[PDB]
Design a protein around this nucleic acid. Sequence first.
RNA 1: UAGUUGGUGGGGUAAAGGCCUACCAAGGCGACGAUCUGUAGCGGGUCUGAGAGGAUGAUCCGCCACACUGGGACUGAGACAC
RNA 2: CAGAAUAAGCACCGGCUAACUCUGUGCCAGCAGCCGCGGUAAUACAGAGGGUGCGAGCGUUAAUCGGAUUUACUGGGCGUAAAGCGUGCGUAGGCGGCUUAUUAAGUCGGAUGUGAAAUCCCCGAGCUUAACUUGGGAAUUGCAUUCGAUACUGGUGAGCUAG
Lengths: 79, 122, 155, 130, 207, 82
Amino acid sequence: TVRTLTGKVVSDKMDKSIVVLIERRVQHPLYGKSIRRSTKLHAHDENNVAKIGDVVTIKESRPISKTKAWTLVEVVEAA
Amino acid sequence: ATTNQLIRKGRTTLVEKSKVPALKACPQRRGVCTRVYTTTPKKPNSAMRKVCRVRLTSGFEVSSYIGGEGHNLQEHSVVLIRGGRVKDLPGVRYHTVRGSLDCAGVKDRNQSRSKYGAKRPK
Amino acid sequence: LVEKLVAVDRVAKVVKGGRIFSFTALTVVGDGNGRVGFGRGKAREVPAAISKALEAARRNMITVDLAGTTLQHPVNARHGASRVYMQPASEGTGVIAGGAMRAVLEAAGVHNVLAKCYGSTNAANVVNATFKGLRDMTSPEKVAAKRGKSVEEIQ
Amino acid sequence: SMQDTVADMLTRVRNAQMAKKQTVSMPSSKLKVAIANVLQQEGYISNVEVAQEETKSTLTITLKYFEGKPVIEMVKRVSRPGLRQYRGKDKLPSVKQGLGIAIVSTSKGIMTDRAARAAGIGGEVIAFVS
Amino acid sequence: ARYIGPKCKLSRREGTDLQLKSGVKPFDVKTKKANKAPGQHGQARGGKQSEYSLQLREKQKVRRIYGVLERQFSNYYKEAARVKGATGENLLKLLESRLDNVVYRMGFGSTRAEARQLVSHRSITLNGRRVNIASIQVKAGDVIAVHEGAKQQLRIKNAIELAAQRGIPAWIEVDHSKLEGTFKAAPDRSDLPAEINESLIVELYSK
Amino acid sequence: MVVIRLARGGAKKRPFYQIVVTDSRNARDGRFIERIGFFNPTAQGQAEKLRLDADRFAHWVSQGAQPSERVASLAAQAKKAT
RNA sequence: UAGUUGGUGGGGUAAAGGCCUACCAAGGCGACGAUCUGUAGCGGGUCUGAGAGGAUGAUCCGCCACACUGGGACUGAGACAC
RNA sequence: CAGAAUAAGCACCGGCUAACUCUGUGCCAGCAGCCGCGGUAAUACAGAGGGUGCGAGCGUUAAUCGGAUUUACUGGGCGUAAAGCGUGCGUAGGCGGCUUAUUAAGUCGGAUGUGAAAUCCCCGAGCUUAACUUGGGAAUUGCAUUCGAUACUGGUGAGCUAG
């Protein structure tokens, strides 16, 4: 009942914060070829469990800081 | 082109320029007659054709043909100009409206009167 | 037998001390029920050229299988730099085509069709392309015969 | 290098038909065999055979000629590696107003556009044959 | 606006009788200049025409009998193309459904101009109401009667006796004693004269 | 507050009202919440004169919507008729 | 890009929040176009076109912004108020 | 109640494009959207007669799309017409051999919610008809959530040898 996204971590320097890269595949509106797009989302990770390279799940939540509105749920795969 | 080439760079369209820049997308313009005179046609035509250099409210100075036989225009007259080229006269891209502001309608004309601006004879 | 004259043009040949003028004529003949042909003729005078073109058209003829008064399926054809597209239409549409295609289609007996030219609009080349397309159009019975099936199987 | 084996197979069939051969052979794959089976079922070709030496597999197809012309007059690849084409159940293409067949790969296997519309599913459009 | 002026040159240009006169005298005795165009450069009927000339000349003939102008005729075509059926058949049905034409064919007017004048001067009633628009479309099962003040008109009695010479059509039944008539349905193409070609109009307006 | 009132449409001298539930601060012929019927003061022939959805009317009144005088009279007349 | 990106204590708001403040750390964005620069109110819709598209945003409806030009706050349920 | 009594113009007639002759002038006066007319017989200039097309309107100018497959996704080209970098290597990217197990991201299907009203289209209703107004539908080709399918593409594990 809560919006979730699955991605891979690309940064862990910040305290209690991780940057995860989301990727999606869509068709070009005119030429019809399938294109891949990427989005970088800041998430909240209280215990710094995540690291660069793991596959994580995040869920939508209320704002925590200026740029963070998502929170970590679980780590699917480890690096 | 390939699909990848089209995605990276799409098709490009070239803009079109108007043939009557001095009108500035208006049906007619008003001007003050700066120089009335006559010119000679390009080959293979020979005549003496009446034109006038006019300064418009658009900030441009152009040349305009005078249609019909017999006109009363002179220096500093106020005239209305429309679009239309004269073809055999190079550089004349506009026409003067007959009988609008200071120009008068042609005389002794009974056909095509709405052009040249002649009223119905009594 | 309905006959149409598509175009007449005047041509010239240069000799010493002047030019020789001649006339060419392109004509299309048909029966209105699936037999149509076209031809060209050259002469010194227009009526003679028309007569020769009509004779050539009568000699060069083919048979076209129609679906009632319209085409079996969409057709794309070409000859040289002229390309033609033809599409079947429902009743009451009429013949929506250019003059060169209109002559051939009406002579062959098509009543409802939509057609379009691309590329060059030379009359002889357009007539050639339309003629080729009408010649090469196929039919469900022929398809079933070639595939070893039944008409209802083919659908 | 070679990057479209299905297109290669269709090109081989087209060239063999234009040169008037009796049989055509190629390296085999399950997708190619599945397409050849649909062609044989629809009646454009006669026989499909697969041979295995040790690990190489050879696929052989027997061609059909009726009157003077070949049975397959047109075969076009629609989906290609540089542009994949997917269609819904209501936008499946029709070939020659139903006189030809469009080969469609759906979640229930490879079939024609007619069978795909009958089953109410869509998929990938491989080729047009007529 | 309605056309006013000479009718015999109008008919002479098209080459066929347009029924613009009462008919007490035949057309040939009426004009004596048939198969001659009105102009001084007028020639015989055999003059060659282009297809564009033929389509235009047919549409003008169709317009001239009914007295309809270009705007209304184009609207009629655009409505007939929308309605399902044969476009020419629909157009003929629309043209024959106008109130003035029904009044003329019912025999209360010697000519369509007379019928138009009678309708416009409020001398006709439709379903019990006095109307004054010539282009009102008449529907199936209608009743057209002559108004009380309109009755006892010598022009009307002459019109009915003249109509007696022709044949009252199938879709219209008239009690001439009561000056009353009943439109039942739109004529099919067979009832109308077959010399009219509508295909030319069709491609002329579908260009 | 929330009101049930008439919004005008139609042609000059021939008004035709929609019955709408809306916030009172909105313009007469503008934003509204829900349309629940119509009123035609000059209906003739086969044309209906007043359609009103009684259940929606009651539901909105139960939540504190205030009908105008004309709408209340129309609702009473419709209830009388049916 | 240096309140800049994140964290802790405190302040502040009807309310989450660098919204503000004192420290701690060096992060944050960018060839999937950051920064700079030109132009522009947005949509339902309208015109054209076989369609795909192209042009457009008067009159009607929804949202936004402005009120001689800039900076503020008061009263009030609600304004930074033609 | 009165009495036809109060009420028709504009463009055009060489071709493209329906509609032709005579007078006046002689590369002059002039016309002209393109091709082009006029330098003593002008169907092309001006007038007149005649005619054609529209009609309370008729013509001109300006602007947008179309015709234009003339930016080509549908739907174009590169030997000589415009167009293959002077030739390699290589980064990002695009694409990629065969078999098998699994996943369900792409892809396909169902259900639910939403996609305001007006506008477009259909069947009706009220205006003497029509414009116009209006009832009910259809449509809004989209988005989101959730449940399913596994042929193809992608991910992961294993295996093979024609590259």
